[PDB]
């Protein structure tokens, strides 16, 4: 369950962003600090990945034998997560440099907890000159294990395999076209129902649509999302707008749409605000798509659940918190909307994009 890059980005066709929560150390910071405490770049200036706080591990207690005159009042300890800056999926050089930079930083962390335990990281350059650390927030410390003891257990810092996630960015117009291997990988999502493409065609035969194939693609994508949220709201007892699961004898069994177990139920988690996709269609085509969605919910779910799931997304509701809504693909001067997906688990097809210890 993580926060990924929010700044505007652009790529020719598709972007890949990797994530790796580390084991063997913690970052301690003042409470309510920003997630990012630093980043790693190539010597040439290319930003590779961010250093972020991940899971809160409890309050920070400075070891008494490392008293230094400093505050450490209300500091929290967190796990560290390495979050890559997205690159083109076909860019072997950029993909490889990210991996190698992550493996090198684990090496640098290993020495840091050995000689500088409970000290902040310093902005340094790698011994070979390839990688450079930039510190964005000096108000932090890095400590071995859980950060309770003054000394480490001699940990070798590694890229934790259970700590891995991937984020794929593709043109919104491509979802449902099966055009590229990545589009096919995303279309294999268990919640995605391709049959809704042919279903839409039967529904709109007497309608003179501007782009029938595009409208069918959008209808299948949104409908599959709206239907999966309804399925999840019922399975987990999630409150969506004014829908009360308890009204349908459903015991609330999760902390909203953002709860990690809900996010993992998607497997391939949509990360872009669903209401954005309507922009890739003409005002008329968008109206036609939106008009046809409600009955798809109403034939499967209660009026209350259907109207609430439909209104939530129409009004710009997100699938799982802050969306990546400013990403674009294609022509630099005439960009097409990009839509992002978080792989909760990394499949075999995306494994080569991750650093392997």
CSV table of C-alpha atoms in Angstrom, one decimal:
chain,number,residue,atom,x,y,z
A,1,UNK,CA,0.0,0.0,0.0
A,2,UNK,CA,2.1,3.0,-1.3
A,3,UNK,CA,2.2,6.6,-2.7
A,4,UNK,CA,3.9,6.9,-6.1
A,5,UNK,CA,5.3,9.9,-8.1
A,6,UNK,CA,2.6,12.7,-8.5
A,7,UNK,CA,4.5,15.3,-10.8
A,8,UNK,CA,3.6,15.6,-14.6
A,9,UNK,CA,5.3,13.1,-16.9
A,10,UNK,CA,5.4,12.3,-20.6
A,11,UNK,CA,6.7,9.2,-22.6
A,12,UNK,CA,6.2,8.1,-26.3
A,13,UNK,CA,4.2,4.9,-25.6
A,14,UNK,CA,4.4,3.2,-22.1
A,15,UNK,CA,6.1,3.9,-18.7
A,16,UNK,CA,7.4,1.5,-16.0
A,17,UNK,CA,7.8,2.6,-12.3
A,18,UNK,CA,9.3,0.1,-9.7
A,19,UNK,CA,9.0,0.0,-5.9
A,20,UNK,CA,11.1,-1.9,-3.3
A,21,UNK,CA,10.5,-1.8,0.5
A,22,UNK,CA,13.8,-2.7,2.2
A,23,UNK,CA,14.5,-5.0,5.1
A,24,UNK,CA,17.3,-4.6,7.6
A,25,UNK,CA,16.8,-0.9,8.4
A,26,UNK,CA,14.5,1.9,9.2
A,27,UNK,CA,14.5,5.7,8.6
A,28,UNK,CA,13.5,7.8,11.7
A,29,UNK,CA,12.0,11.4,11.0
A,30,UNK,CA,10.0,14.0,12.8
A,31,UNK,CA,6.2,13.2,12.8
A,32,UNK,CA,4.2,14.4,9.8
A,33,UNK,CA,7.4,14.7,7.6
A,34,UNK,CA,7.0,14.4,3.8
A,35,UNK,CA,7.5,10.8,2.5
A,36,UNK,CA,10.6,11.7,0.4
A,37,UNK,CA,13.9,12.3,2.3
A,38,UNK,CA,16.2,12.0,-0.7
A,39,UNK,CA,16.8,10.6,-4.2
A,40,UNK,CA,19.5,8.9,-6.3
A,41,UNK,CA,20.6,10.2,-9.7
A,42,UNK,CA,23.2,9.2,-12.3
A,43,UNK,CA,26.4,11.3,-12.5
A,44,UNK,CA,25.0,12.7,-15.8
A,45,UNK,CA,21.9,14.2,-13.9
A,46,UNK,CA,19.2,11.6,-14.7
A,47,UNK,CA,16.9,11.1,-11.5
A,48,UNK,CA,16.7,7.3,-10.9
A,49,UNK,CA,14.6,6.7,-7.8
A,50,UNK,CA,13.4,8.3,-4.5
A,51,UNK,CA,14.2,7.3,-0.9
A,52,UNK,CA,11.0,7.3,1.0
A,53,UNK,CA,9.5,6.4,4.4
A,54,UNK,CA,7.0,3.5,4.0
A,55,UNK,CA,5.4,1.6,7.0
A,56,UNK,CA,5.3,3.3,10.4
A,57,UNK,CA,7.2,1.1,12.9
A,58,UNK,CA,6.3,3.1,16.0
A,59,UNK,CA,7.9,6.1,17.7
A,60,UNK,CA,11.6,6.7,17.6
A,61,UNK,CA,13.6,6.3,20.8
A,62,UNK,CA,17.2,7.6,20.4
A,63,UNK,CA,19.5,5.0,22.0
A,64,UNK,CA,20.8,6.5,25.3
A,65,UNK,CA,24.4,5.6,24.3
A,66,UNK,CA,24.0,7.8,21.2
A,67,UNK,CA,22.7,11.0,23.0
A,68,UNK,CA,24.0,13.9,21.0
A,69,UNK,CA,22.2,17.0,22.4
A,70,UNK,CA,19.5,16.8,19.6
A,71,UNK,CA,15.7,16.8,20.0
A,72,UNK,CA,14.3,13.5,18.5
A,73,UNK,CA,11.0,14.6,20.1
A,74,UNK,CA,8.0,13.0,18.4
A,75,UNK,CA,10.1,11.3,15.8
A,76,UNK,CA,8.6,8.2,14.2
A,77,UNK,CA,10.5,5.2,12.7
A,78,UNK,CA,9.5,3.8,9.3
A,79,UNK,CA,10.6,1.1,6.8
A,80,UNK,CA,12.4,2.5,3.7
A,81,UNK,CA,11.0,2.2,0.3
A,82,UNK,CA,12.9,2.8,-3.0
A,83,UNK,CA,10.5,4.4,-5.6
A,84,UNK,CA,11.8,4.7,-9.2
A,85,UNK,CA,11.2,7.7,-11.4
A,86,UNK,CA,9.3,6.1,-14.4
A,87,UNK,CA,11.1,5.4,-17.7
A,88,UNK,CA,10.1,3.9,-21.1
A,89,UNK,CA,9.5,0.2,-20.8
A,90,UNK,CA,11.7,-0.4,-24.0
A,91,UNK,CA,14.5,1.7,-22.5
A,92,UNK,CA,16.9,-1.2,-21.5
A,93,UNK,CA,19.6,1.3,-20.4
A,94,UNK,CA,17.3,3.3,-18.1
A,95,UNK,CA,15.8,0.1,-16.7
A,96,UNK,CA,19.2,-1.4,-16.0
A,97,UNK,CA,20.7,1.8,-14.4
A,98,UNK,CA,17.7,1.9,-12.0
A,99,UNK,CA,18.3,-1.7,-10.9
A,100,UNK,CA,22.1,-1.2,-10.5
A,101,UNK,CA,21.6,2.1,-8.6
A,102,UNK,CA,19.3,0.3,-6.2
A,103,UNK,CA,21.8,-2.6,-5.7
A,104,UNK,CA,24.6,0.0,-5.1
A,105,UNK,CA,22.5,1.9,-2.5
A,106,UNK,CA,21.8,-1.3,-0.6
A,107,UNK,CA,25.7,-1.7,-0.5
A,108,UNK,CA,26.0,1.9,0.7
A,109,UNK,CA,23.3,1.3,3.4
A,110,UNK,CA,25.2,-1.8,4.6
A,111,UNK,CA,28.4,0.3,5.3
A,112,UNK,CA,26.2,3.2,6.7
A,113,UNK,CA,24.6,1.1,9.4
A,114,UNK,CA,28.0,-0.4,10.2
A,115,UNK,CA,29.9,2.8,10.6
A,116,UNK,CA,27.2,5.6,10.9
A,117,UNK,CA,24.3,3.9,12.7
A,118,UNK,CA,21.5,6.4,13.8
A,119,UNK,CA,23.1,9.1,11.5
A,120,UNK,CA,21.4,10.7,8.5
A,121,UNK,CA,22.6,9.7,5.0
A,122,UNK,CA,25.1,12.1,3.4
A,123,UNK,CA,24.8,13.4,-0.2
A,124,UNK,CA,27.7,11.3,-1.7
A,125,UNK,CA,28.9,9.9,-5.0
A,126,UNK,CA,29.4,6.2,-5.6
A,127,UNK,CA,33.0,4.9,-5.6
A,128,UNK,CA,32.8,4.3,-9.4
A,129,UNK,CA,31.2,7.7,-10.0
A,130,UNK,CA,28.0,6.3,-11.6
A,131,UNK,CA,25.5,7.2,-8.8
A,132,UNK,CA,24.9,10.3,-6.7
A,133,UNK,CA,22.8,10.6,-3.5
A,134,UNK,CA,20.8,13.9,-3.1
A,135,UNK,CA,19.4,14.6,0.4
A,136,UNK,CA,16.0,16.4,0.2
A,137,UNK,CA,15.4,16.3,4.0
A,138,UNK,CA,18.4,16.3,6.3
A,139,UNK,CA,16.1,15.9,9.3
A,140,UNK,CA,16.2,12.0,9.3
A,141,UNK,CA,18.4,9.2,10.6
A,142,UNK,CA,19.1,5.7,9.2
A,143,UNK,CA,19.3,2.8,11.8
A,144,UNK,CA,19.8,-1.0,11.5
A,145,UNK,CA,16.9,-3.4,12.1
A,146,UNK,CA,14.1,-1.6,14.1
A,147,UNK,CA,16.3,1.4,15.2
A,148,UNK,CA,16.0,0.5,18.9
A,149,UNK,CA,19.6,-0.6,19.6
A,150,UNK,CA,22.7,1.6,19.2
A,151,UNK,CA,24.4,-1.3,17.3
A,152,UNK,CA,23.4,-3.3,14.3
A,153,UNK,CA,23.2,-7.1,14.1
A,154,UNK,CA,25.8,-6.8,11.1
A,155,UNK,CA,22.9,-6.8,8.5
A,156,UNK,CA,23.6,-7.0,4.8
A,157,UNK,CA,21.0,-4.6,3.3
A,158,UNK,CA,19.2,-6.3,0.5
A,159,UNK,CA,16.3,-5.6,-2.1
A,160,UNK,CA,13.5,-7.4,-0.2
A,161,UNK,CA,11.5,-9.7,-2.7
A,162,UNK,CA,8.3,-9.4,-0.7
A,163,UNK,CA,8.8,-5.6,-0.8
A,164,UNK,CA,8.3,-5.4,-4.6
A,165,UNK,CA,5.6,-3.6,-6.7
A,166,UNK,CA,5.5,-2.2,-10.3
A,167,UNK,CA,3.5,0.7,-11.8
A,168,UNK,CA,2.7,0.6,-15.6
A,169,UNK,CA,1.5,3.7,-17.5
A,170,UNK,CA,-0.2,3.2,-20.9
A,171,UNK,CA,-2.3,5.4,-23.3
A,172,UNK,CA,-6.0,5.3,-22.2
A,173,UNK,CA,-7.0,4.8,-25.9
A,174,UNK,CA,-5.0,1.5,-26.0
A,175,UNK,CA,-6.9,-0.2,-23.1
A,176,UNK,CA,-8.9,-3.0,-24.7
A,177,UNK,CA,-7.1,-2.9,-28.1
A,178,UNK,CA,-4.6,-5.7,-27.1
A,179,UNK,CA,-2.1,-3.9,-29.4
A,180,UNK,CA,1.1,-4.3,-27.2
A,181,UNK,CA,2.3,-7.1,-24.8
A,182,UNK,CA,1.9,-4.6,-21.9
A,183,UNK,CA,-1.7,-3.8,-23.0
A,184,UNK,CA,-2.4,-7.6,-23.1
A,185,UNK,CA,-0.8,-8.0,-19.6
A,186,UNK,CA,-3.1,-5.3,-18.2
A,187,UNK,CA,-6.1,-6.7,-20.0
A,188,UNK,CA,-5.5,-10.1,-18.2
A,189,UNK,CA,-6.6,-8.3,-14.9
A,190,UNK,CA,-9.3,-10.5,-13.2
A,191,UNK,CA,-11.7,-7.6,-12.9
A,192,UNK,CA,-11.4,-6.6,-16.6
A,193,UNK,CA,-14.3,-7.9,-18.8
A,194,UNK,CA,-13.4,-7.6,-22.5
A,195,UNK,CA,-16.9,-9.1,-23.5
A,196,UNK,CA,-18.4,-5.6,-22.5
A,197,UNK,CA,-16.8,-4.3,-25.8
A,198,UNK,CA,-19.0,-6.5,-28.0
A,199,UNK,CA,-21.9,-6.0,-25.5
A,200,UNK,CA,-21.7,-2.1,-26.1
A,201,UNK,CA,-21.7,-2.6,-29.9
A,202,UNK,CA,-25.1,-4.4,-29.6
A,203,UNK,CA,-26.4,-1.6,-27.3
A,204,UNK,CA,-25.4,1.3,-29.7
A,205,UNK,CA,-26.2,0.0,-33.2
A,206,UNK,CA,-28.7,2.9,-33.9
A,207,UNK,CA,-26.3,5.4,-32.5
A,208,UNK,CA,-24.0,7.4,-34.9
A,209,UNK,CA,-20.9,7.6,-32.6
A,210,UNK,CA,-17.8,9.6,-33.5
A,211,UNK,CA,-15.5,6.7,-32.5
A,212,UNK,CA,-17.4,3.4,-31.9
A,213,UNK,CA,-14.3,1.3,-31.2
A,214,UNK,CA,-12.8,3.9,-28.8
A,215,UNK,CA,-16.3,4.3,-27.0
A,216,UNK,CA,-16.5,0.5,-26.7
A,217,UNK,CA,-13.0,0.3,-25.2
A,218,UNK,CA,-13.8,3.1,-22.6
A,219,UNK,CA,-17.2,1.6,-21.7
A,220,UNK,CA,-15.5,-1.9,-21.1
A,221,UNK,CA,-12.7,-0.3,-18.9
A,222,UNK,CA,-15.1,2.0,-16.8
A,223,UNK,CA,-17.8,-0.7,-16.5
A,224,UNK,CA,-15.2,-3.3,-15.4
A,225,UNK,CA,-13.9,-0.8,-12.8
A,226,UNK,CA,-17.5,0.3,-11.5
A,227,UNK,CA,-18.5,-3.4,-11.3
A,228,UNK,CA,-15.3,-4.4,-9.4
A,229,UNK,CA,-15.8,-1.6,-6.9
A,230,UNK,CA,-19.4,-2.8,-6.3
A,231,UNK,CA,-18.1,-6.4,-5.9
A,232,UNK,CA,-15.4,-5.2,-3.4
A,233,UNK,CA,-17.9,-2.9,-1.5
A,234,UNK,CA,-20.1,-6.0,-0.9
A,235,UNK,CA,-17.3,-8.5,-0.3
A,236,UNK,CA,-15.5,-6.2,2.3
A,237,UNK,CA,-18.4,-4.0,3.6
A,238,UNK,CA,-17.0,-0.8,2.2
A,239,UNK,CA,-18.9,2.5,2.6
A,240,UNK,CA,-19.1,4.2,-0.9
A,241,UNK,CA,-20.7,7.7,-0.7
A,242,UNK,CA,-24.2,7.2,0.9
A,243,UNK,CA,-24.1,3.4,0.5
A,244,UNK,CA,-24.2,1.6,3.9
A,245,UNK,CA,-23.2,-2.1,3.7
A,246,UNK,CA,-25.0,-2.7,7.0
A,247,UNK,CA,-28.3,-1.8,5.1
A,248,UNK,CA,-27.7,-5.0,3.0
A,249,UNK,CA,-26.7,-7.0,6.1
A,250,UNK,CA,-23.0,-6.7,5.3
A,251,UNK,CA,-20.5,-6.5,8.1
A,252,UNK,CA,-17.9,-3.7,7.5
A,253,UNK,CA,-14.7,-5.7,7.3
A,254,UNK,CA,-12.1,-3.2,5.8
A,255,UNK,CA,-11.0,0.4,6.3
A,256,UNK,CA,-12.3,1.8,3.0
A,257,UNK,CA,-11.2,1.5,-0.6
A,258,UNK,CA,-7.6,2.3,0.5
A,259,UNK,CA,-7.2,-0.7,2.8
A,260,UNK,CA,-4.2,-2.9,1.7
A,261,UNK,CA,-6.4,-6.1,1.4
A,262,UNK,CA,-8.9,-4.3,-0.9
A,263,UNK,CA,-6.0,-3.0,-3.0
A,264,UNK,CA,-4.5,-6.5,-3.3
A,265,UNK,CA,-8.0,-7.9,-4.4
A,266,UNK,CA,-7.7,-5.8,-7.6
A,267,UNK,CA,-4.2,-7.5,-8.3
A,268,UNK,CA,-3.7,-4.9,-11.1
A,269,UNK,CA,-4.8,-1.7,-9.4
A,270,UNK,CA,-6.0,1.2,-11.5
A,271,UNK,CA,-4.0,4.3,-10.2
A,272,UNK,CA,-5.6,7.0,-12.4
A,273,UNK,CA,-8.9,8.8,-11.6
A,274,UNK,CA,-11.6,6.9,-13.7
A,275,UNK,CA,-13.5,10.2,-14.7
A,276,UNK,CA,-10.4,11.3,-16.7
A,277,UNK,CA,-10.9,8.8,-19.5
A,278,UNK,CA,-14.1,10.5,-20.6
A,279,UNK,CA,-11.8,13.4,-22.0
A,280,UNK,CA,-10.3,11.0,-24.7
A,281,UNK,CA,-13.9,10.9,-26.2
A,282,UNK,CA,-16.0,13.6,-27.9
A,283,UNK,CA,-18.7,15.2,-25.6
A,284,UNK,CA,-21.4,13.1,-27.4
A,285,UNK,CA,-19.5,9.7,-27.3
A,286,UNK,CA,-18.7,10.3,-23.5
A,287,UNK,CA,-22.5,11.0,-22.8
A,288,UNK,CA,-23.4,7.7,-24.7
A,289,UNK,CA,-20.8,5.7,-22.7
A,290,UNK,CA,-22.0,7.2,-19.3
A,291,UNK,CA,-25.7,6.7,-20.1
A,292,UNK,CA,-25.1,3.0,-20.7
A,293,UNK,CA,-23.0,2.2,-17.5
A,294,UNK,CA,-25.8,2.5,-14.8
A,295,UNK,CA,-27.9,-0.5,-16.2
A,296,UNK,CA,-24.7,-2.7,-16.1
A,297,UNK,CA,-24.5,-2.1,-12.3
A,298,UNK,CA,-28.4,-2.1,-11.8
A,299,UNK,CA,-28.7,-5.6,-13.3
A,300,UNK,CA,-26.0,-6.9,-10.9
A,301,UNK,CA,-26.3,-4.7,-7.8
A,302,UNK,CA,-29.0,-2.9,-5.7
A,303,UNK,CA,-30.3,0.5,-6.7
A,304,UNK,CA,-28.5,2.1,-3.8
A,305,UNK,CA,-25.1,0.4,-4.4
A,306,UNK,CA,-25.4,1.1,-8.2
A,307,UNK,CA,-26.4,4.8,-7.9
A,308,UNK,CA,-23.7,5.4,-5.2
A,309,UNK,CA,-20.8,3.6,-7.1
A,310,UNK,CA,-21.9,5.5,-10.3
A,311,UNK,CA,-22.1,8.9,-8.6
A,312,UNK,CA,-18.8,8.4,-6.8
A,313,UNK,CA,-16.8,7.9,-10.0
A,314,UNK,CA,-18.8,10.4,-12.1
A,315,UNK,CA,-17.9,13.1,-9.5
A,316,UNK,CA,-14.2,12.1,-9.8
A,317,UNK,CA,-13.8,9.6,-7.0
A,318,UNK,CA,-10.6,7.5,-6.9
A,319,UNK,CA,-10.1,3.7,-6.8
A,320,UNK,CA,-7.5,3.8,-4.0
A,321,UNK,CA,-6.6,7.3,-2.9
A,322,UNK,CA,-4.5,10.0,-4.7
A,323,UNK,CA,-4.4,9.2,-8.4
A,324,UNK,CA,-1.7,9.8,-11.0
A,325,UNK,CA,-3.9,12.1,-13.0
A,326,UNK,CA,-1.3,14.3,-14.8
A,327,UNK,CA,0.6,11.7,-16.9
A,328,UNK,CA,0.6,11.8,-20.7
A,329,UNK,CA,1.7,9.6,-23.6
A,330,UNK,CA,2.4,10.1,-27.4
A,331,UNK,CA,3.2,13.4,-29.1
A,332,UNK,CA,4.9,15.9,-26.9
A,333,UNK,CA,2.9,18.8,-28.5
A,334,UNK,CA,-0.5,17.0,-28.6
A,335,UNK,CA,-0.4,14.5,-25.7
A,336,UNK,CA,-2.8,11.6,-25.1
A,337,UNK,CA,-4.1,10.8,-21.6
A,338,UNK,CA,-2.1,8.1,-19.8
A,339,UNK,CA,-3.7,5.7,-17.3
A,340,UNK,CA,-1.6,3.9,-14.6
A,341,UNK,CA,-1.8,0.5,-13.0
A,342,UNK,CA,-0.1,-0.8,-9.8
A,343,UNK,CA,0.8,-4.5,-9.8
A,344,UNK,CA,0.3,-5.5,-6.1
A,345,UNK,CA,2.5,-8.5,-6.8
A,346,UNK,CA,5.1,-8.5,-9.6
A,347,UNK,CA,4.2,-11.1,-12.3
A,348,UNK,CA,6.9,-13.1,-14.1
A,349,UNK,CA,6.5,-10.8,-17.2
A,350,UNK,CA,7.7,-7.8,-15.1
A,351,UNK,CA,10.4,-9.6,-13.0
A,352,UNK,CA,13.3,-8.5,-15.3
A,353,UNK,CA,12.4,-4.8,-14.4
A,354,UNK,CA,13.2,-5.4,-10.7
A,355,UNK,CA,16.7,-5.5,-9.0
A,356,UNK,CA,17.7,-9.0,-8.0
A,357,UNK,CA,20.1,-9.5,-5.0
